[PDB]
């Protein structure tokens, strides 16, 4: 399939027991795990039939053999036994309901009670509809169902009782309960047999017979303990131990630390635990039992953070770490994808491999060597330069003896790192004098310099090194209140030890043909196309400098061309005021443009015409806010680093030699009068000639392949559908000199 998601499991924050499966949530990703049988588990995304992206909680209806999926966006999905999804978007669509936070997802029979920042919602699981919302727009701390259709609600430190047979959408229908306990301190409540338990913020746990509600202290857990409600019992998870409360107030203690969720069915003797950063584990509910670990065979990225990505030597290189003026503390993470499996270098791994006092945080740029895929460098914003070699971190460069200059004692912020054609590492440093540096990995020699016009600026962006040796670096920040963010082009002229022979041009602001400013505030992305043009993206859109190699030699300020699109009477600049985060260039010299808030665009050679655009609305794209791009020129897979994780789109730009056109097909075949939209040519390769002819041979439609698909309205010039018969699709790729003749029928 054309779209795919490369999502992370990692921190299991929730767990639910199913008669034959164990559903669990890790960072918003829902997934299944087999019980008695050795796994046969499953990962569930929007591609699997789900209606939304980040899972906020789950619960199972033993009676309806269905799972309720509640999303961070307020959306609801019902996963039936057959694996059929039913959407319940009433909460998400309610604009007035501004807080979607969920506190309790209680499933009683064939009803689900959702208590959150929106109120208390009654979900009809069998019929996917919400017949009522009590306390609408008020945070409801918890919910509990009792005998004789009675419902218990904890809101604003008050406990209310109400009969479901009355109009509980009316405040007068509920009765406020005065109980001997500090109700304002109650963080959770749940029913266990003939009792109701109340957990207090200070750790205490109160128990009360459901027929009297007279509270007495059951146990004294540690402060800020968590309560997990289950049909089998209640779990009081304190720091270092759990309290399992069951019928008749039997309490069992277990030394299980950092527990985020528990799953157990009414008649189960084993509970499934969510240990977060560890994952899943099963526990036999008996005094002398240990939580036996659950296996996670799923391999994915370390996290879903793709701040910066690069594609080299048939591998993806990604940096998760965050950038800002002082937006630090994000755990360091380097992710490498083989095309099948992941390799993750996290904060702890790197610190152990190198040893000592440094923090390995905010990894923000990658630089891969030419010829050695396992030899790459990583720039951390605050912790220095890192050398990776043969699957381990072999060195950390920061401070004295190194050219990695520190802006503060122990603070070296490294961004815009790249390698030259000669195998040297060029890079820039933030908030220091000798800004620009070079490292010879072979001779292990260092050289740093700067140009007064660019020296001591807060932060640079990314570096592109043109074939003639020119180095382009974008300016992300000078200082607090400075608009002097441009681009610096420079050539060291083979001697990184001197500036005396260098050529450089600092272009604070670019101009058009008429000598006016473009108007860009910041340059976020830069790309060299096949026509020797440096296409750059900014806060006000995209624009390219033609013959970029001659800028240092030219006798004028470089001219930037803002692409012009649309028909002759109605023209415009291709995406004005749209913040462009990344640019990648096709085998066809077409441009893949990532934007902050308006999805993904595919533009023509000169960026004049939009060839395609993908958003959350029109495509399986996870988020309209894309942070990075990377393209596998060999199999045509474009990696899309969205704010909500990694995705891949088959561009059809692949260098797949044999059987490349063996996959072309038309659907629907035959084309019946009840199918109005027309036909779709699929399994193509971008850049292909596609022509439709009658059995005679006269062409009726002709195009080039944009993506993997081409569409035909299947009608004549008169707008009425084309006559019955056998039509033919001739596909020719100019590159391989091979053709594909496929036929489809139009029937009465
Ligand atoms: C591993 As190679 C020498 O083909 O870049
Ligand atoms: Ca050398
Ligand atoms: Ca020089
Ligand atoms: Ca989102
Ligand atoms: Ca080809
Ligand atoms: Cl029903
Ligand atoms: Zn119903
Ligand atoms: Zn993160
Ligand atoms: Zn990048
Ligand atoms: Zn290689
Ligand atoms: Zn190597
Ligand atoms: Zn040297
Ligand atoms: Zn200068
Ligand atoms: Zn084109």
Residue numbers in the entry: 29 to 776
Task: Quote the study on this structure.
The most recently discovered system of protein secretion is T9SS, also called Por secretion system, which operates exclusively in selected species within the Bacteroidetes phylum. T9SS is essential for the secretion of many proteinaceous virulence factors by P. gingivalis, and has, thus, attracted considerable attention as a possible target for pharmaceutical intervention to treat severe periodontal disease and restore homeostasis of the oral microbiome.
We produced PorZ without its predicted signal peptide (residues Q26-R776) by recombinant overexpression in Escherichia coli, and succeeded in crystallizing and solving its structure by single-wavelength anomalous diffraction with a selenomethionine derivative. The structure was refined with data to 2.9 Å resolution and consists of three domains. The first two are consecutive N-terminal seven-stranded β-propeller or circular-leaflet moieties (βD1: residues K39—M322; and βD2: G29—L34+Y335—T679 373839; PorZ residue numbering in superscript notation according to UP Q9S3Q8), each featuring a shallow cylinder or thick disk with an “entry side” and an “exit side”. These domains are succeeded by a C-terminal domain (CTD, V692—R776). The two propellers are offset from one another by a ~90° rotation about the intersection axis of the propellers’ planes. In the case of PorZ, which consists of two consecutive seven-fold propellers, the N-terminal segment of the polypeptide chain follows such a mechanism and forms strand βD2-VII-β4, while the remaining three strands of this blade are provided by the polypeptide chain after forming both propellers. Along this line, the crystal structure of PorZ revealed potential polyethylene glycol fragments bound at the hinge between βD1 and βD2 on their entry side, as well as on the exit surface of βD2.
